Every structure is written in C-alpha cells, then in structure tokens.
From a paper:
Recombinant enzymes that were heterologously expressed by the secreting system of P. pastoris are often glycosylated, and high-mannose type N-glycan was observed in protein crystal structures. To investigate the effect of N-glycosylation on the crystal structure, we crystallized the N247A mutant as an N-glycan–deficient form. The crystal of the N247A mutant was isomorphous with the WT protein crystals, and their crystal structures are virtually the same (Cα RMSD = 0.077 Å). This result revealed that N-glycosylation did not substantially affect the three-dimensional structure of FoRham1.
Residue numbers in the entry: 1 to 419
Write the structure that this text describes.
Amino acid sequence: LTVKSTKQWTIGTDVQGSERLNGVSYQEDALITYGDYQYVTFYETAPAGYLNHFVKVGRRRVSPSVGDWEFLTLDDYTQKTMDGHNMISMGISGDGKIHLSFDHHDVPINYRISKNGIAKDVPSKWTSDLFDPVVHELVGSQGPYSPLTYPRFEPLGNGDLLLEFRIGQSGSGDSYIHRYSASTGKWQAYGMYIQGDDNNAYINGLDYLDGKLYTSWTVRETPNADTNHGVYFAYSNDDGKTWFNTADTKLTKPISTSDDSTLIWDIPQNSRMVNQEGQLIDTKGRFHILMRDLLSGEHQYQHYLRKADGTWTKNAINPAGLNGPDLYDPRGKLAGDASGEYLFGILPDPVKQSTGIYVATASKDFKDWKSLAEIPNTSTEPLFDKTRLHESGILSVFVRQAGGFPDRKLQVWDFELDL
Ligand code: NA
C-alpha cells in the first residue's frame, strides 16, 4: 500500500480560545461523504468576534469528479462557551437529511435538521435557509435531554440514524440512544443503554456493520481523568435495544458499569489511559480499539483486537518515529479500507505536532505498523471520512492546525491510496 497523491484544502480559520472546539476526538462525525458529495462542519468566528462562533457546513462534489468547497453559515445560533467538550457532530440519514447536534457540556440538547433531503435531492444553492431552527428535543421521542454531553450519530443500514449521548456528568452518568426513522421523520427513544454506578462509561464511538452495532468503553470514577479503569466491549443485533458481551451472553438492559462480564482488559486507574479515543469495526467484522497507557514503563498507543476466533489481543503501536502519548495529549482514530485487509492508524504525535498515518495488515496480524504519510502542523484529534475511504480508496482527514490565531487553519487532507 502506497500513497498516489496528497492534496489539502484550507476550509476556515480556527476560532480563538483556551480550548479546542474544532477537531475533537468524539466528533461523530465531522466529515461525511453521502452519494456524490462530501460534507464537513466546524465553528468559525461570528462578527461579534472573540467568544462568538457560528456553525458552518461545507459541501463539495467528490464523484465522479472533485469540485470546490462551498459553505453556509448558521448565523442564528451563537456558540459562546469556551469549553473543549462543546463540539459538533453531524449525521446524514437515508432520506438525505443532514442532522447537527452541538455545543454541550452538561446542558440540554441542541439539535437541528435540514428542511428537506438536501444530500439526496441536491440543491443548487448552499445557504443557511436549508436548515430548520435549533430545537431542544427529538420530535417523536422523549427526554431526558439534559444534562447532555457527547452527541454521536451512527447511520443504520435502512437509512435510519442513531443519536447517542451521556445524560449526567463526569463520574456519575448514564448513556441513551434515540433512533430517527428516515421513512417517517420521527425519532424514537431506545432508552438508557448503559447505566453508571457513581461513575460513567466513556464509549469510544459507535460502529455499525451488517446489522450489528459495536461499542467499547472505559469507566471513569470521578472528574479526574486519572480515574479511568478497564476496557469494555458489547454489541447489539437490534440497533441498540439489547446487548451482548464478547461471548454472546445477553446483558441486562441497561448495561451496568458494575457488570464485569463486559470487561475485555483489565487496566487500573492511574494507567494514563484516556477516555473516548478510537474504535473500528473492520469490513471483515474484526473489532479494534485504540487506547494508550504507561503500563510498559513508556507511554504508548495500544491496539486491542477482537479476533475471529473470539480471543482478544493487546499490542503496542510502536512504529519507528512515533512518540507515545500521555493522558492529556490528542486522541487518535482507526480507519479501514473496503477489503478489511488494511488498518490505518491516524495518530497525533505530541512531540512532532503532526498527525501520522500508519498502516498495518490483517495478514501480519496487524503487527507490521509502517509509516505511510503525515499531516504536518496539527494540534488536533484527527477525524476521517469512512464512506469516502470505502467507496473511492481516498483517506480524507479533517484537522485543526497547530499555531496561533489567526494563522491556525482548519483543513481537509486527502490521501489517494494505491490499493
Ligand atoms: Na463518581
């Protein structure tokens, strides 16, 4: 596997503040290809200036040829909270509607949707009046909608879309799932799916494939990030309603954090393992987790693999040149190609201030981590476009630069792979 071409686009000037609001690990998702177009969402500074931001949505054609990015500005909702949790997630349902949820730390939901199926019936002009107003509920469903943190969308096989989030707080919280029907345009409540016990679960993502939904998490005892422990796994065959552990034993609904039957790796507190890193169901149905720890005596990224035979392995990701991360350094992701043979680590390097792209192969049990490419000058938790990789073999990554405001840009990097 090699790189055929590298291209980049600047899509905006990043916002100013003590926190990163753009390029946050648990954006799910920031960058999406649907049909022949790619979409991206981010904050830009509003005319009021410092500590006033608007959500922007960009689109560009990517098939059968790539055209120019265009942007709309949602100038009816001003983001004002300088808190690194207050990021944006986007999802696109099979009716072509684009959904956004954003700007939360332990507050009520903020959600909006496009009026029509703009990703399906693609409009000529790209303007803010394509979107309905911000609301604080999910029409058809029920709360609780507060205190909410961490909206995450997952598109299902039939065009429906899940929205998942935590209700409660760091160190005492539960998570919930809601399902949007692309046939009726109504949401329904799947209810609480994981319940804290004077702690909270921190999932790594949602991963849906061929009718199964996969998640992994660590449990956090207090608002101190040193109090994460364990790596846990469960999956569902019914889009979030009921769940199983790795041995296919049905769990209680909700899953409790006190239930050790979902633990796949013991990792104590003070291991320097961070919450909400990365996960991946590969196209062959092998599940992967990206985390980190200091348990070897050095800080290293860690790859957990759920093998076809049922067994779990844990391998450090330690290719030449990669500096290992500590607890508060930027988080990475794992991406997969269409074939399921190639695993990409998209790993921010805290020494280099860059994003490395490393590749391993299923033929070598993913032990053969090799440097494939680099994105220079990043201070970001890198995020990629699953569908674009599957469909065209192009690894497209959304990044916040390193550097000072207003030099620090937002960009999209495309690596064309020679599959
Ligand atoms: Na607690």
